Design a protein around this ligand. Structure first.
Ligand SMILES: NCCC(O)(P(=O)(O)O)P(=O)(O)O
Ligand SMILES: NCCC(O)(P(=O)(O)O)P(=O)(O)O
Ligand SMILES: NCCC(O)(P(=O)(O)O)P(=O)(O)O
Ligand SMILES: NCCC(O)(P(=O)(O)O)P(=O)(O)O
Ligand SMILES: NCCC(O)(P(=O)(O)O)P(=O)(O)O
Ligand SMILES: NCCC(O)(P(=O)(O)O)P(=O)(O)O
Ligand SMILES: [Co+2]
Ligand SMILES: [Co+2]
Ligand SMILES: [Co+2]
Ligand SMILES: [Co+2]
Ligand SMILES: [Co+2]
Ligand SMILES: [Co+2]
Ligand SMILES: [Co+2]
Ligand SMILES: [Co+2]
Ligand SMILES: [Co+2]
Ligand SMILES: [Co+2]
Ligand SMILES: [Co+2]
Ligand SMILES: [Co+2]
Ligand SMILES: [Co+2]
Ligand SMILES: [Co+2]
Ligand SMILES: [Co+2]
Ligand SMILES: [Co+2]
Ligand SMILES: [Co+2]
Ligand SMILES: [Co+2]
Ligand SMILES: [Co+2]
Ligand SMILES: [Co+2]
Ligand SMILES: [Co+2]
Ligand SMILES: [Co+2]
Ligand SMILES: [Co+2]
Ligand SMILES: [Co+2]
Lengths: 301, 300, 299, 299, 300, 301
C-alpha cells in the first residue's frame, strides 16, 4: 500500500516549487491566448497542467544550474532536498509532462518533442557561455533566448492551436517570438534593477550566476577599456560569486556607460512591435484582447 | 556554424559515450535476439536508443552520487560542470524517447522509464536522509532503478519480433529473466565496488563508501541483533562530510570482513545465478533454441 | 602560580559573568521555604549547582555548535573548543569535590548517580541528531527527564539531605520526585518552545538556534504528509546549519499545522499537574509555598 | 534500556577495544610487587585507572584534532566531537564513582585533587598552542608533571592506600612521589620524542602528528637564529595543520641543530635518576623490584 | 596596441588612483612648500612621485591586511586578484623611484624607502605570529612604516629648495615635525578604525579587528596588571579564523569601553598635537613665515 | 642593539629561498659569459650577488603569484611565512638589489631600471592571461617571454658588458633573447613531462596555475573541436586547481594532438640558432666557450 509513499518521495521536490506561489505570466498567457482561440475549458485545463509541469520542472533545473539560493523569497528546491533528488524529480517530471501531452494530442509529440528539445539547445548555449566565460554577440543572445524562453511560449501556443485561421497561425509565431524576447530581456533587466527581484532572488543574483545579459554584452562589445569590469567578472567566476560591493561596482560601471538605457530602448521597441502584432490579430480575428495587452503591459519597466 | 551549437549541447554526451562501455547492455540485446531474430537494422535502432538512455542515466547518476571517476577517467561533470552535464542528460533522454517513437508506435515505454526515476528516487532519498532500508525495499528499489533497463530493451525487441510465434509463452518467462538479471547485476555492482581491484582502478577505492549508498552487505549486518554503534556512526560521519578517509573506509571493510557479511551477498548472487540458469533453460527448450550467448552473459 | 589557575578557569569565569540566570536559584529558594535548610549550607548548595549548570552550558553550547549565549559570543568562540571542553570537565569534578566537602554517605553516591543520568540524556540527544533519527514523543520526554529534570533533582537531593529535623524526608520523597520531573519537563519543553517563538530567543541565541543544532523540539516531533521538512533538516545536517530563509520555512510549516498550539496545550496541562503536586506537598508539610507557585508562573 | 547505555558508552568501547596499552598496567604490576596489594583490589584499581586513561585519550585526541589513534580513525572521527566529549566526561565521573566504591576518607580527596591537576596541566598545554606562546623548558616540565606524571601518581596513591600492613607508607612516600615524577617526565618526553622519530609514530598516529597539533616537544623548545621555524608553526596554526612537506622541513632544522641529541641526553639522565630512586626504595623496603627496572628499559 | 599591454600592467594602479584620496599627502607638501617655496613644476614632479609611492603602498597593504574595502569600494585585489595587484604595485614603486631619479640625483631616498618595508615587516610579523609588541616597539614601527613617507617628501622638497638659506636651521626641526606627524596620523588611523562611523563606511565595521593588528588601545590594556584572558583569546580566535564575527568585534569594543583604553589613545594624540603645534611654532618664527596650512593640516 | 632582530625579520623570507639550493642556470650563465668578457673577479662578484637577489626576489613573487605549493621539493616561501610577509620582503629585496647595482655602476640605473620594469610588463601579461582566461597567440607568448625571462638574461649581460667589442654587443643581444626563449619554453615543457619537475613542484603544477604554455596555445588555435579540453580548463579555474586524473586527461589530449612534438620542434630550432650565435661569437672573439655550450646542452630534452 505504501506505493503512495514512493510516489510522494519522487514528487516531493516538484510539490515544493509548485506550492509556493511564483506563477503569473504562464497562466495569463494561456488565458489571454484562449480569449481568441476559444478552446473548450476541459482541453485548456489539460494543456495548462502539462505546461505547468513542464515550466516548473525547468525551474527546478534552472535554479540548480544557475546555483540560485532563492526563488520567490524562499529557499530554492535543491536547498531543501539537495541537487541530486531535485534533478531526478525534475527530469522525471518532464517525461511525465510529455506523456500527458501525448494523451490528449495526436502525433503530431513529433512537433512538441522537437520544440522541447530546442529549449535544451537554448539552455546549452546559456550554460556554455557562463561556464567557459565566453561573451556572446547580441544576435547569439537573441537566438539563445528564442530557444530557451521564446520556444516555451510557442509550445503552449501550438497545443492550443491544435485544439481549435490558417493565416492567423503565422502571426502567432511572430507573437510568441517577440514575447519571448520581452520576457527574458526584462527578466535580466529587473534582476539588476528591481527591489522585488532583490527580495525574491537576492541582490543581483545574475552577477553571482555570471550570466551574460544584454547590458553586459552591449558594453563589453562597446569599444572602450573596461579593464576593471573584465577583472571583477573573472574574480566572480573564481570565487563562485560576488560581494555586495563588487555587484555595486558592476552596477556603477553599467550606470556610467548607460548600457541599461540601451536595454530599455530594445524593450520599448519590442513593445511597439508586440502592440502592432496584437492589434493585427484582433483585427484579423473577431474581437479585441485586453488580457494580452495587460500581459504586455506587465512586462515594461 | 548551426552545427556548432549542437556540438556544445551534445559535448558531454559524446564524452561519456567515447569511453569503453563493457557492453553488458549490448551483449544482452544480442543474446535476446538469438531467440527473437529481429533484422539487423531494427535491432541497431533499438541498440542506439537504449545506449542513449543508459549513457544519459550514467550522466545523471555520476553527478547524483558525486562520483569523481568513471572508467578510470574524470566523471563528466568534472569536465563540463554539473549544469551542462545535467542539461544534455535530460535532453538526451528526450532524444532517445523521440528515437524510440520513430520506429515503434504503441506501446510499455516510455512509462517504464518513469519507473527508473522512481527507483533512483528511493536510492537518493535513503542516502540523503540516512534511512536504512530493508532487504525487500532494497530489492524493490533495484527492480525499478536497474532491472527496468533490461525490461525496456526486451519489450522493444519483443514488439519488433516476427509473427513466428508466440509472444504469449515467452512474456511470463522473459519478465522473470530481466528482473533476475537486474537484481544480480546491481548486487554484483554494489559487491564489486568494495572488493574488486579493477573497480578501485575505475571508480577509486570503495567509492560507494564515499557515496554512502546502502549495499546488501551493510543492510544485512545492520538489521542484525548484534550491536553496531561504531559502524552506524562512521556511515553518518561520512554523510556529514563529503565522504570517508581511507582509514574510515578500511574500518568499514574490517567490520565487514570480521562478520563475513560479503559472504551473504555471495550466497544471494549464486542463488540468483541458479534461478537465472533455470529460467534460461525453460526458454531454450520452449523455443527449441539453446542460447550460449545468454549463458555467457551470465558468466559474471 | 595564580596565573595557571586563572588560565584553567577563564572559560568558566566567562559564562559565569553572563546574566544567564533566574530559574536555578529561584527554585532552590522556593524549595527551601519548605525544607528550611540553614542559609550557610544553602549557599554551598547554590554554589555547587551553579558550577554544575554552568559546566553543562559550556559543553552543550560546544556540542550544539551554538554561536551565541545571552547575546554574546559563546565560550568556545572565545577560547576555542579544546580549552572550553577541558575547563568544563574540570569544573564538573571541582563541583563534585565541593559537594563531597559538606555531604557524605549515600548522599554523594546519589548525586554521582544523578549526574551520570544527565550524560545519559545528553547522549540520546546527541546520538539522535548525529545519526538523523527522529525520536518519538515518549523517547523525547524520557530524554528530557534525564538531561533536564535531573538537574532539579540534584538540587532537591542536596537540600533534602540537609533538611531540618522537623521534616519527614521519607513521606515527602516521590512527591518531590514527581515535582522535579514535572518541573524539568515543563522547563525544557518551554525552552525548546521559546527558541522558535521569542526574542530573547533571537536576541540571546540568534534566530531559531535549535534549527541550526538540529534539535528535536516537541513541535517538530509532533508532525513527523511532511516530506519537505525531513529533507531540509538533512540539508541542515550536511551543511553547517540552516540559512535564515531555511529556518523561516520550518516556521511556516509549524504555523500551518498549528504545532505551536499543541505544545501550548501540553504546557498548560503540566501547569495543572504541578499545581496539584505543590498542593499535596503543602498539605503534607502543613506549609504553603507561594514562592514555588510564583516560580511556576514562568511562561 | 541497555540500548541507551550502549549508546552512551559506544565511544568509550571504541578506544577500549584498541591495543593502546603496555605501560599503565605494567607500572601497576611493578609497583605492586612492592606494595603487595590483594589481587582483587588491584583489579579494581586497574579498571578505574584504565577508564581514566582512556577518557583522557578521548579528550586529548579531540582537543589536539588527531585523525588517527593506533592506526585506526580517532574516536571523534567515528562518533563526532559532541558524542565523544560527552561520553568521555561521563566516563571520568563513572571511574571516580568506582574509586569511591572501594576507597573512602582522604584517599578520595587526594585522587580528586590529583585528577584536577591533570586538567591544570592540559589547560597550560592547550592555552599555549591556542595563543601561540612558546613555553620555556621549566614551564614545559611543570606542564608535564601535571598532565602526565600525575597519572602515575594516582595509581600509586590508590595502591599505597591499599598496601599491606607490613609496609610503612610514611617512610616510602616522597620516594614514590619522586619516582612517579621522574617516570612521568621520562614517559612524556619519550612520547613527544618518538612522535617525530618513529613508526609506530607514523603508522599509529600519522607522520609527525605533534606538528599538526602544534605541540611543544622538548626538541622544538630547545631551539626557540630560528626565524623560519617560528612562522611555519604559525602557518600551521592558521591552517588546519601542516602539509607533509612542511613537517619534513621542521625535521630538517631539528636534525641540523641536533635537537634530537639533546632530548636523548635528557632521557639518559632520567634513566640514571630513576635507577638511583628505585635502589633507595629497594633498600628501604628490603625488596628488589626487577619489574620496575624492566619497565624502565622502555626506550 | 603596444599601448594595450601597458594598460594591463597599470590597470590596478589606475583603479586605486581613481579613488578620492583625502589628499593628506598633498596637503602636507603644499603646506611645507609655503615655507620652502619651490617652483610649481618641481613641486608637481615631487607630488606625482610621492603619490605613486603612497598608492603603491596601499596596493600592497590592502592585500597584506586582507582588507575587503578601500574608500567604500572593493579593494584592488578584489578586482584584479592578488597576483596582478602585487605585480604592478612592485612595478609602480620601481617607476616612482625612476621618476625621482630623473629630476634629483643625490641623495636619503631611496634608502628611506627600505625603512618603510622594515616597518611593515614588524607590523606583518607581529600580526602573523601573534606577538604583542611594547608601546616603544609600536612607536618605532610606526616611525618606520608611516612617518618615513613624510620624511621622504620633505627631503625631496628640501633638496629642491633655493639658496635662500639655511637648510641647517630647519633640518633638525623638520625631522622632529615629520616624525611627530607620522606617529599621530597612524595612531589616529588605528584609533578612527574602531570608533569613526565614516571609517565603518569606508573600510567596514572594525576592520582592524579582522586584520588583527596591534593598535595602541589594545597594547596598553594588555600589558596591564589586570588579567585579560578573554580579550587575549578572542584575538587569537580571530587570527585562527579569517577574522571576527560582529559579536566578537562588539565584545572587544565593550572591553575597550569598560576600561576606557581609547581615552589613553586620545591623551597620547593630544600630547602629540601639542608638540606638533610647538614644532610648527619654532619654524614659523625662525623663518619669519607663519604657516596656516600646516596648522590647518593638524586639524584632524 | 636588536636592530639586527628587525633586519632578520625583514629578510627571513629571502633567507629561506636563498638557502634551499635551487640554483643552476643563473650562475652558470654569468660564469660562461665572463669566459668571454674577462671581467675582474671582484666586479663579477658584485654583479652575481645583485642578480641573485633580483632573481630570488622574483621567485618569491612568482611562487605566490602562481600559487605554487612547492619549490625544489620544499614548501614555497609563502607557505612558511605567509603571502603578506613574503611579498613585503620580496619587494624590499628588489629595491635593495637595485641599490647594489647603483653602487658599482654609473647611470647609465636608467638602463637597468628600464629593463627591470620590462620584467614586470612581461609578468603583467602572463598573469593577465591566466587570471582572465585569455589564450594568447604564439607571438604574444614569445614577446611575453622575451620580457619576463629573456630580459633577465639581458640584465646580467648589460652589467658585465659595462665593466669590460662594439659589434660584439649586438650579437649578445641575439644570444640572450634566444636563450630566454629556450629556458622558458623548456621550463613549460618540462613542467608537464619531467618527473624531477614532478618532485620539485608537484604533478603538472602549471595546470593548477592555469598558465598558457606553447603546447596548449598551439592546439587551442589548432582548428579542431576540443569541447572537452576547453571545459576542464574552465573547471580548473573554477576549482583553483585540477585533480590528478584531470591533469592526466589534459596530457592525453596533448599527446593525441602531438602538440608537445611542436614544442620539441621549436626548441630544436632554437638550439640551432643558439649554436650558430655562440660559434659566431667564439670566432668574432679570442677563443671558444665550452661553458656556454654546456649550458645550452643542459636546456634540451
Ligand atoms: N526562465 C526561468 C529562468 C530565469 O528566467 P529565472 O530568472 O532564474 O527565473 P533565468 O534568469 O535563469 O533565465
Ligand atoms: N545504477 C547505475 C549506476 C551505478 O550502477 P554505477 O556503479 O555508479 O555505474 P550505481 O552503483 O550508482 O547504481
Ligand atoms: N539543557 C540546558 C541547555 C539548553 O537548555 P540551552 O538551549 O543550551 O540553554 P538545551 O535546549 O540545549 O537543552
Ligand atoms: N598525555 C596522553 C596523550 C598523549 O600522550 P598522546 O600523544 O595523545 O598519546 P600527548 O602527547 O597528547 O600528551
Ligand atoms: N599604513 C597605511 C595603511 C593603513 O594606514 P590603512 O588604514 O590600511 O590605509 P594601515 O592601518 O594598514 O597601517
Ligand atoms: N622563471 C621563474 C618562474 C617559472 O619559470 P617557475 O617554473 O615557477 O620557476 P614560471 O613557470 O612561473 O615562469
Ligand atoms: Co478568458
Ligand atoms: Co535562473
Ligand atoms: Co537560467
Ligand atoms: Co532571471
Ligand atoms: Co546480419
Ligand atoms: Co553511481
Ligand atoms: Co547511483
Ligand atoms: Co555502483
Ligand atoms: Co526563602
Ligand atoms: Co544547546
Ligand atoms: Co543541547
Ligand atoms: Co534550547
Ligand atoms: Co606482580
Ligand atoms: Co594528543
Ligand atoms: Co595533547
Ligand atoms: Co604525543
Ligand atoms: Co603657481
Ligand atoms: Co591596512
Ligand atoms: Co597595514
Ligand atoms: Co588603518
Ligand atoms: Co671562467
Ligand atoms: Co612560477
Ligand atoms: Co610564473
Ligand atoms: Co615554470
Amino acid at each position: 500500500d505504501h506505493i503512495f509513499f514512493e510516489k510522494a518521495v519522487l514528487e516531493a521536490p516538484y510539490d515544493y516549487i509548485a506550492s509556493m506561489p511564483s506563477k503569473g505570466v504562464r497562466d495569463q498567457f494561456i488565458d489571454a491566448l484562449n480569449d481568441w482561440l476559444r478552446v473548450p475549458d476541459v482541453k485548456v485545463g489539460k494543456i495548462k497542467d502539462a505546461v505547468r509541469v513542464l515550466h516548473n520542472s525547468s525551474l527546478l533545473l534552472d535554479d540548480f544550474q544557475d546555483n540560485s539560493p532563492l526563488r520567490r523569497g524562499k529557499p530554492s528546491t535543491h536547498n531543501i532536498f539537495g541537487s541530486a533528488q531535485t534533478v531526478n524529480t525534475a527530469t522525471y517530471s518532464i517525461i511525465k509532462a510529455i506523456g500527458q501531452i501525448m494523451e490528449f494530442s495526436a502525433g503530431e509529440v513529433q512537433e512538441v518533442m522537437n520544440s522541447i528539445m530546442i529549449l535544451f539547445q537554448g539552455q546549452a548555449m546559456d550554460l556554455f557561455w557562463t561556464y567557459n566565460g565566453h561573451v556572446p554577440s547580441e544576435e547569439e543572445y537573441y537566438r539563445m533566448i528564442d530557444q530557451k524562453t521564446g520556444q516555451l511560449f510557442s509550445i503552449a501556443t501550438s497545443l492550443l492551436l491544435n485544439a481549435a485561421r490558417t493565416k492567423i497561425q503565422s502571426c502567432l509565431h511572430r507573437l510568441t517570438r517577440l514575447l519571448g524576447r520581452c520576457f527574458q530581456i526584462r527578466d535580466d533587466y529587473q534582476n539588476l534593477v528591481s527591489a522585488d527581484y532583490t527580495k525574491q532572488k537576492g541582490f543581483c543574483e545574475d552577477l553571482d550566476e555570471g550570466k551574460w545579459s544584454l547590458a553586459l554584452i552591449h558594453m563589453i562589445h562597446k569599444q572602450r577599456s573596461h579593464m576593471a569590469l573584465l577583472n571583477v567578472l573573472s574574480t566572480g567566476r573564481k570565487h563562485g560569486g560576488m560581494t555586495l560591493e563588487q555587484k555595486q561596482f558592476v552596477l556603477d560601471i553599467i550606470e556610467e556607460e548607460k548600457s541599461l538605457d540601451y536595454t530599455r530602448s530594445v524593450m520599448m521597441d519590442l513593445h511597439v512591435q508586440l502592440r502592432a502584432e496584437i492589434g493585427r490579430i484582433e483585427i484579423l480575428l473577431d474581437s479585441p484582447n485586453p488580457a494580452m495587452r495587460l500581459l504586455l503591459e506587465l512586462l515594461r519597466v
